[PDB]
Design an enzyme around this catalytic site. Sequence first.
Site, PDB file in Angstrom:
ATOM      1  N   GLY A 102      79.668  11.822  12.745  1.00 47.83           N
ATOM      2  CA  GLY A 102      80.722  12.453  11.965  1.00 47.83           C
ATOM      3  C   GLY A 102      80.308  12.666  10.530  1.00 47.83           C
ATOM      4  N   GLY A 105      78.013  15.123   9.652  1.00 51.00           N
ATOM      5  CA  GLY A 105      77.828  16.532   9.400  1.00 51.00           C
ATOM      6  C   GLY A 105      76.611  17.114  10.064  1.00 51.00           C
ATOM      7  N   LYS A 106      75.996  16.360  10.971  1.00 50.62           N
ATOM      8  CA  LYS A 106      74.798  16.816  11.663  1.00 50.62           C
ATOM      9  C   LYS A 106      74.966  18.102  12.485  1.00 50.62           C
ATOM     10  CE  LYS A 106      74.375  12.982  13.953  1.00 50.62           C
ATOM     11  NZ  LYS A 106      75.556  12.441  13.197  1.00 50.62           N
ATOM     12  N   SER A 107      75.991  18.131  13.340  1.00 47.12           N
ATOM     13  CA  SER A 107      76.250  19.287  14.216  1.00 47.12           C
ATOM     14  C   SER A 107      76.649  20.517  13.422  1.00 47.12           C
ATOM     15  CB  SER A 107      77.338  18.940  15.232  1.00 47.12           C
ATOM     16  OG  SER A 107      76.810  18.075  16.221  1.00 47.12           O
ATOM     17  N   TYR A 108      77.483  20.307  12.425  1.00 49.74           N
ATOM     18  CA  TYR A 108      77.926  21.385  11.576  1.00 49.74           C
ATOM     19  C   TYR A 108      76.740  22.034  10.877  1.00 49.74           C
ATOM     20  CZ  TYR A 108      80.595  23.992   8.141  1.00 49.74           C
ATOM     21  OH  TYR A 108      81.120  25.008   7.362  1.00 49.74           O
ATOM     22  N   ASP A 123      69.257  18.003  16.862  1.00 48.90           N
ATOM     23  CA  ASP A 123      70.535  17.468  16.413  1.00 48.90           C
ATOM     24  C   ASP A 123      70.537  16.078  17.060  1.00 48.90           C
ATOM     25  OD1 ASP A 123      73.173  17.209  15.501  1.00 48.90           O
ATOM     26  OD2 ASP A 123      74.003  18.114  17.332  1.00 48.90           O
ATOM     27  N   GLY A 156      74.157   9.724  16.506  1.00 47.55           N
ATOM     28  CA  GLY A 156      74.520   9.013  15.293  1.00 47.55           C
ATOM     29  C   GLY A 156      73.607   7.830  15.019  1.00 47.55           C
TER      30      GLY A 156
HETATM   31  N1  LIG Z   1      79.093  21.123   4.737  1.00 43.68           N
HETATM   32  C1  LIG Z   1      80.271  20.993   5.371  1.00 43.68           C
HETATM   33  N2  LIG Z   1      81.294  21.879   5.063  1.00 43.68           N
HETATM   34  C2  LIG Z   1      82.512  21.761   5.703  1.00 43.68           C
HETATM   35  N3  LIG Z   1      82.881  20.876   6.619  1.00 43.68           N
HETATM   36  C3  LIG Z   1      81.874  19.996   6.922  1.00 43.68           C
HETATM   37  C4  LIG Z   1      80.577  19.984   6.362  1.00 43.68           C
HETATM   38  N4  LIG Z   1      79.821  18.945   6.904  1.00 43.68           N
HETATM   39  C5  LIG Z   1      80.688  18.333   7.774  1.00 43.68           C
HETATM   40  N5  LIG Z   1      81.934  18.908   7.814  1.00 43.68           N
HETATM   41  C6  LIG Z   1      83.133  18.546   8.633  1.00 43.68           C
HETATM   42  O1  LIG Z   1      82.939  17.304   9.183  1.00 43.68           O
HETATM   43  C7  LIG Z   1      83.076  17.222  10.584  1.00 43.68           C
HETATM   44  C8  LIG Z   1      81.969  16.411  11.202  1.00 43.68           C
HETATM   45  O2  LIG Z   1      80.657  16.933  11.042  1.00 43.68           O
HETATM   46  P1  LIG Z   1      79.955  16.979  12.425  1.00 43.68           P
HETATM   47  O3  LIG Z   1      78.798  17.947  12.379  1.00 43.68           O
HETATM   48  O4  LIG Z   1      80.943  17.416  13.460  1.00 43.68           O
HETATM   49  O5  LIG Z   1      79.513  15.512  12.831  1.00 43.68           O
HETATM   50  P2  LIG Z   1      78.158  14.852  13.327  1.00 43.68           P
HETATM   51  O6  LIG Z   1      77.315  14.500  12.126  1.00 43.68           O
HETATM   52  O7  LIG Z   1      78.566  13.647  14.105  1.00 43.68           O
HETATM   53  O8  LIG Z   1      77.396  15.820  14.183  1.00 43.68           O
HETATM   54  C9  LIG Z   1      83.313  18.640  11.123  1.00 43.68           C
HETATM   55  O9  LIG Z   1      84.432  18.606  12.049  1.00 43.68           O
HETATM   56  C10 LIG Z   1      83.454  19.506   9.820  1.00 43.68           C
HETATM   57  O10 LIG Z   1      84.772  20.123   9.687  1.00 43.68           O
END
Ligand SMILES: Nc1ncnc2c1ncn2[C@@H]1O[C@H](COP(=O)(O)OP(=O)(O)O)[C@@H](O)[C@H]1O
Length: 328
Positions: A97, A99-102, A245, A248
């Site tokens: 959570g 921001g990796k996937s995003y 990707d 965690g």
């Molecule tokens: N640079 C960013 N801008 C906007 N929202 C972000 C950003 N990075 C993370 N988020 C928010 O945080 C959440 C989690 O990031 P996510 O990629 O889903 O998790 P993980 O790191 O587990 O893969 C998303 O649902 C997204 O809305």
Amino acid sequence: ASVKVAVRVRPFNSREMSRDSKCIIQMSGSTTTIVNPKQPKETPKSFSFDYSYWSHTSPEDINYASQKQVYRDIGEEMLQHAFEGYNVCIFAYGQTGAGKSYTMMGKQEKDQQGIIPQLCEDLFSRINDTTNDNMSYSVEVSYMEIYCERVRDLLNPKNKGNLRVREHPLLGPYVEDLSKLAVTSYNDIQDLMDSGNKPRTVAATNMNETSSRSHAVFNIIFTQKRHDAETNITTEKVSKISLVDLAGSERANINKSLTTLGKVISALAEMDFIPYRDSVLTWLLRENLGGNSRTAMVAALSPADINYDETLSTLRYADRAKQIRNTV
Ligand SMILES: Nc1ncnc2c1ncn2[C@@H]1O[C@H](COP(=O)(O)OP(=O)(O)O)[C@@H](O)[C@H]1O
């Protein structure tokens, strides 16, 4: 060539807003500073990286780091190397959570698409903009998930075989029988990417969202064929692009690959033996971590006070990776 490293802090999320979390992250230039909420009496620890991305506010901020900057910085740089003939690799690392996937996939809308979509798009754009008829291209893709040391074809969830990772006597590690599909357009690649994303393993522990214990590896085999009427031999340049990707960092064993990755990074940073084969992840990514490949890391960071320990740990492992140097 040093492993380039970037770190990126996102905006608060629901969990953090519900506990009234404060922001303990600060950025300026390529430096990221973290405060200790429990011991405010200490001095804040600072790290420096190739890029310190402030994405904590919103794209309405002049200083928000957008999916476009991130890609245009590291994504673009790697694609250009791919065209040079270099294998490349980019992996996202960080707490669940964070921001990796995003950062890697993002959201297909509002120009919220991450590095993978943008790179694929950028890649076909360039290919279709070729005007030298002596040049022809080929693009193959593969997409897999590694969950608990088990490897699954995400483009072919119609086969339950937990593909076996084999070491080729001469050519290196490879996932046996993993599908490799020729794609001739961005739309096609994006469709495979979409179906692949749904195939990922989910977990009730994550409110049945994608399990925070699965690693996804998106690979592209980019072949360039250069022909010239003369001797009539067509030369070939093959670059492998690995976009990763990761599960965690702290969100046939559950956390083997991630713990092992940590050791391999530490080992490599120190060295300049390495336990590559201790896990399927580090085994498959051997040449991308020390081997012949240009590589980069993007570490996702939570900005919340409640995630201090996990975030400090991510900053530290990112600092380490910065010291790795591949032999290309
Ligand atoms: N640079 C960013 N801008 C906007 N929202 C972000 C950003 N990075 C993370 N988020 C928010 O945080 C959440 C989690 O990031 P996510 O990629 O889903 O998790 P993980 O790191 O587990 O893969 C998303 O649902 C997204 O809305």
